[PDB]
Amino acid sequence: KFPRVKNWELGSITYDTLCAQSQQDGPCTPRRCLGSLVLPRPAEQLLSQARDFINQYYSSIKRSGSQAHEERLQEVEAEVASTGTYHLRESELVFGAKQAWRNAPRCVGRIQWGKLQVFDARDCSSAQEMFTYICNHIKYATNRGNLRSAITVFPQRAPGRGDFRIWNSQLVRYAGYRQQDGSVRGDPANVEITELCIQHGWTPGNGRFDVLPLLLQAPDEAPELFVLPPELVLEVPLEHPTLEWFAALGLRWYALPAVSNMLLEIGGLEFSAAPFSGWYMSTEIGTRNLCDPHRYNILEDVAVCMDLDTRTTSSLWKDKAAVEINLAVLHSFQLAKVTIVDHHAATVSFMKHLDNEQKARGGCPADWAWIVPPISGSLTPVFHQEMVNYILSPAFRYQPDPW
Amino acid sequence: GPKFPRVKNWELGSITYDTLCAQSQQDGPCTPRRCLGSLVLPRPAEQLLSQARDFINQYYSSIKRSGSQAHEERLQEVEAEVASTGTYHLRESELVFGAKQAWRNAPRCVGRIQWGKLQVFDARDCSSAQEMFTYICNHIKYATNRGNLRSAITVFPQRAPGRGDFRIWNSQLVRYAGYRQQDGSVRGDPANVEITELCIQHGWTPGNGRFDVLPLLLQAPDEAPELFVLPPELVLEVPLEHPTLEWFAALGLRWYALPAVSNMLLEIGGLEFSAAPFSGWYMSTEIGTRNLCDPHRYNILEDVAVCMDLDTRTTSSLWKDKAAVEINLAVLHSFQLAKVTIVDHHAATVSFMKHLDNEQKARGGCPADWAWIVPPISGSLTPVFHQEMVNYILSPAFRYQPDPW
Ligand code: HEM
Ligand code: HEM
Ligand SMILES: Cc1cc(N)nc(CCCCCCCc2cc(C)cc(N)n2)c1
Ligand SMILES: Cc1cc(N)nc(CCCCCCCc2cc(C)cc(N)n2)c1
Ligand SMILES: C[C@H](O)[C@H](O)[C@H]1CNc2nc(N)[nH]c(=O)c2N1
Ligand SMILES: C[C@H](O)[C@H](O)[C@H]1CNc2nc(N)[nH]c(=O)c2N1
Ligand SMILES: [Zn+2]
């Protein structure tokens, strides 16, 4: 029943009892494990999720069983029975957004989970208003380089109508221009959204790092285009501490990682637009975004500049170039005084987080493949830590693209 | 599409469906409620016969004589034997097939493109610890082949009805001693502190170096294990140096040529071969990243970083990553110089991708454990990081077995 969880570096063992609180099945069965897959393939039920969430909330404020708790359960029940749905109080929304983050198995930054600014944007009625709230978020979160975690929550999905959606996958994305000869200029991850923006009327540039406009959608309307004011998108030019030519690569990344296409589920209610942001771990930029062969793919270029023997894998040219690029990212963010965390510091804080959650809740859902960094895995303590992965609610969830 | 798991490569965009998993007859540790894929060790008569029939069907399929008269006579032969003895025995060619298939089936092995090239030594006539030692030395000589390594397994008698097992007590044929110190630190390999102490309890005179090769504790049915020293000339080792950092050689680090697992159970058609040591060649990260840099192994990162004059006082200098790369390069360079077979993690993962394609066509899938397949440095720089994998247990199989003591 309750899995034993061992750390193989220290020999310490815990038991996950928190997983018993899971109500949603993942993709694994006793016949086969699907844990490396990136994606998975009525009133009575809303009422149970609603009730369980309100119980979660009153328990957190230590008022479990109180008058307030009972009356609030009655409101929820009365509202659902009459209308087939309900609405959260602001404080409940705040609690549920933090819990969704806390519950996120793929997030290595969860030590921070209790520190989240929640902007309530549920009184939004147009793409125009969405834009204003998004700019306020960016400005707040960016804070001239001293980044602060934030979420803005737009109106929940409703039975009658279409969703509020932000089409872009992040608030900040560089264009990817598909070229005649089949290559890509810019970020190949963003080809499709770049073509959408143009098709909806954007005048495209032709750089490797052109910031995309937002396509914002109010219910049952065509999305609208909105150019972010350049002054709101903080960027960091990349340079290397000792390698002078590196700056000459013209590389850069944006300060603010802000995910904008995930669904936030709290107590059975769904928030189809609820962008959220923290600060980056350097390997996201230095390893994945710049070195993935299907991303900016700069490994070779960097290795030649370093004059490495590129002819053979056993010279470890890829490994050496990747280290330097990661170093350049850390250096430059430090130089520009913009919050960043390296993969060693981040995984150490995650280990402290596991221990906190063990005491607090008796476990912590974690996806080992996503937690362990993409370079130097076993040099970080999380590589040696067993982890149990399961879905708790409140949750952030993947949702299909709106087009 | 199909009612089998969809498997995607996020680098290339390509998709397959694993149909092979339908052949799995044994449950792993995961359920719909929670994934336990990251756990290292998760916790007959009519049963034997059904496993035997399945294995014999597998054998006859592989030789394309499925449904044939020889196929039906063999099945009858197996149940007759089980009917009268409670057990049965494999033909030589059945053993060779099952051993290769146990390797092909191993989800944690990245080297499986080589699975068809395994020399299977049949040692099922062995009846003493002394003879086990001879067989093991022959295995070591054949497999080592003066640095031109050749994959091999040697198979000792199977488990039998309430008669004791053949066991090799050591986890590998080559292991460096780990000596517990008066201050609680370890000299040598901390992985091997228990077996080192077991060797001394059984009469071994200990050394005091960081790289003392252990003797073997070999157990024949119903006897106490006996101790055997490997002739030093049989254990090929590689002194580590670095191609440009001249001081690395002065560190006195080394590793042995032959990775030879000796404590796993080989299961074929319900038969259990408790002693069946097998060996291949190393992927360089196993030595240079894990064995040398794990904090709970030789733990050399800080020493190397100090020699490289790195800033070890702050995580963000990436001193750990820089030192680990150089140590891996030293491992590769030293083995190449010594002419001892080794494969780096780029070339190994690339060959594992080819393996996956071959197996897609041949069997409809390939059981693979993503956390074990992805190397412990430079993970996402290798093509396997971007490749989804389905993990499931097929038989024949290599299985972990409890330590004999
Ligand atoms: C405070 C700084 C934070 C750091 C350093 C951090 C770290 C990370 C990293 C490295 C990833 C993997 C990203 C990738 O591989 O593409 C990630 C994923 C994720 N994080 Fe965080 N995180 C932070 C804050 C947040 C916040 C504020 C939230 C939401 C309130 C959040 C929720 C998530 C979710 C839901 C994922 C998985 C996304 C997916 O499945 O696509 N994180 N985190
Ligand atoms: C030919 C060269 C080979 C290479 C490069 C190779 C590579 C590897 C690596 C890197 C591991 C993970 C070890 C660790 O992290 O400690 C492994 C595990 C494994 N390999 Fe191979 N392998 C090779 C040959 C073999 C052979 C000949 C067999 C058996 C016939 C084999 C069966 C296994 C098994 C059963 C495991 C899992 C061990 C466990 O769970 O403890 N491999 N392999
Ligand atoms: C198909 C698919 C599914 C899925 N769940 N996720 C993805 C892409 C994941 C992109 C997330 C990248 C943003 C990560 C992030 C978010 C935050 C808030 C902080 C931080 N340091 N990093 C694709
Ligand atoms: C507790 C535990 C369980 C388990 N299944 N496995 C382990 C790890 C044992 C380490 C296995 C070392 C395999 C080394 C090897 C073996 C072969 C044949 C080739 C090659 N390159 N490497 C521990
Ligand atoms: C196939 C595999 O699951 C996939 O490549 C995962 C591996 N681990 C990851 N880990 C993080 N943090 N982010 C990722 O995108 C991925 N990709
Ligand atoms: C907890 C975790 O499963 C454990 O540290 C695993 C991770 N991946 C591994 N991968 C390989 N090849 N070898 C290992 O010993 C491990 N250890
Ligand atoms: Zn699983």
Contact between A35 and B30 using a beta-carbon 8 Å cutoff: yes
Q: Which among A7, A376, A387, A393 is the top mutation candidate for probing chain B, defined by the most B β-carbons within 10 Å of its own β-carbon? A: A376
Which residue out of A107, A124, A197, A364 is catalytically annotated?
Answer: A107
Give me ligand 7 centre to Cα A28, in Å: 5
CA–CA separation, A155 and A123 (whole Å): 7
Same domain assignment for residues A24 and A105? yes
Contacts of A82 (CB under 8 A, 6+ apart): none
CA–CA separation, A103 and A23 (whole Å): 13
Same domain assignment for residues B87 and B23? yes
Same domain assignment for residues B69 and B84? yes
Residue B15 in contact with partner chain A when CB distance is under 8 A: no
**B10 inside domain:** no
Contact between A386 and B39 using a beta-carbon 8 Å cutoff: yes
Same domain assignment for residues A134 and A217? yes
CA–CA separation, A6 and B194 (whole Å): 19
* Cα angle B183-B184-B190, degrees, rounded to a multiple of 5: 140
Which value, in Å, is the radius of gyration of the alpha carbons in chain B? 23
Provide φ and ψ at B218, rounded to 5°.
-115, 135
Q: Domain containing B343 — which CATH number?
A: 3.90.1230.10
Q: B379 and A377 in contact (C-beta within 8 Å)?
A: yes
Distances (CA, A) of B40 to A241, B36, B105, B302: 40, 9, 17, 27
Contacts of B162 (CB under 8 A, 6+ apart): none
| A215 DSSP β-pair partners | A225
CB contacts of B379 in chain A (<8 Å) are 372-375, 377
- Residues whose Cβ atom is located within 5 A of ion ligand 7: A 28, 33, 35; B 30, 35, 37
Q: A266 and A158 in contact (C-beta within 8 Å)?
A: no
**B181 inside domain:** yes
**Residue B281 assigned to a binding site:** yes
End-to-end CA distance of chain B: 51
Same domain assignment for residues A29 and A102? yes
Same domain assignment for residues B245 and B270? no
Active site residue B370: no
**A384 inside domain:** no
* Cα angle A121-A124-A128, degrees, rounded to a multiple of 5: 115
Residue A183 in contact with partner chain B when CB distance is under 8 A: no
Q: B168 and B197 in contact (C-beta within 8 Å)?
A: no
Same domain assignment for residues B183 and B251? no
Breaks after residues in chain A, judged by C–N over 2.5 Å = 41
Residue B45 in contact with partner chain A when CB distance is under 8 A: no
In ligand 1, which atom is closest to the CA atom of A281? 5
Q: Domain containing A36 — which CATH number?
A: 3.90.340.10
Distances (CA, A) of B325 to A288, A322, B12, B213, B294: 18, 10, 27, 27, 14
- Please give the single-letter amino acid code of residue A378: S
3 state DSSP class of B296: coil
**A377 inside domain:** no
CA–CA separation, B46 and B268 (whole Å): 16
**Residue B142 assigned to a binding site:** no
Among the residues of A103-213, which ranges form H helices? Answer: 127-142, 191-199
CA–CA separation, B349 and B266 (whole Å): 25
Other Cβ atoms within 10 Å of A50 Cβ, number: 23
CA–CA separation, B213 and B190 (whole Å): 14
CB contacts of B324 in chain A (<8 Å) are 376, 379
**B386 inside domain:** no
Provide φ and ψ at A402, rounded to 5°.
-70, -5
**B382 inside domain:** no
CB contacts of A387 in chain B (<8 Å) are 38
* Cα angle B150-B154-B157, degrees, rounded to a multiple of 5: 175
Q: Which domain holds residue B134?
A: 125-150+165-236+400-404
3 state DSSP class of A133: helix
Q: Domain containing A171 — which CATH number?
A: 3.90.440.10
**A29 inside domain:** yes
Give the tokens for residue B306.
Answer: 């100090």
CB contacts of A25 in chain B (<8 Å) are 32-33
Q: Which of A138, A79, A104 is nearest to A364 (CA)?
A: A104
Give resolution in angstroms: 2.0
Distances (CA, A) of B242 to A144, B148, B300: 45, 22, 15
A222 lines ligand 3 (CB under 6 A): no
According to DSSP, the β-strands at A150-153 and A117-120 are parallel
CA–CA separation, B168 and B216 (whole Å): 7
**B252 inside domain:** yes
**Ramachandran region of residue A56, left (φ > 0), alpha (ψ -120 to 50) or beta?**
alpha
**Residue B35 assigned to a binding site:** yes
Q: Which of B283, B362, B282, B345 is nearest to B105 (CA)?
A: B362
Active site residue A113: no
Q: A196 and A215 in contact (C-beta within 8 Å)?
A: yes
Q: How many domains does chain A have?
A: 3
| B61 DSSP β-pair partners | none
CA–CA separation, A119 and A125 (whole Å): 16
Active site residue A279: yes
Same domain assignment for residues A34 and A66? yes
Q: B179 and B186 in contact (C-beta within 8 Å)?
A: yes
Which residue out of A19, A101, A102, A110 is catalytically annotated?
Answer: A110
Same domain assignment for residues A91 and A177? no
CA–CA separation, B135 and A284 (whole Å): 51
Q: Which of B28, B315, B378 sits opposite A344 (nearest CB)?
A: B315
From B23's Cα to the closest Cα of chain A, the distance in A is 9
Provide φ and ψ at A140, rounded to 5°.
-65, -50
Q: A73 and A51 in contact (C-beta within 8 Å)?
A: yes
CA–CA separation, A254 and A275 (whole Å): 16
Indicate if the alpha-carbon torsion angle A179, A182, A188, A191 is positive or negative. positive
Q: B366 and B9 in contact (C-beta within 8 Å)?
A: no
Same domain assignment for residues B242 and B337? yes
* Cα angle A33-B389-A396, degrees, rounded to a multiple of 5: 70
Active site residue B65: no
Residue position matching structure tokens 């995650």: A350
Same domain assignment for residues B78 and B144? no
**Residue B286 assigned to a binding site:** yes
Same domain assignment for residues A204 and A138? yes
Contact between B380 and A389 using a beta-carbon 8 Å cutoff: no
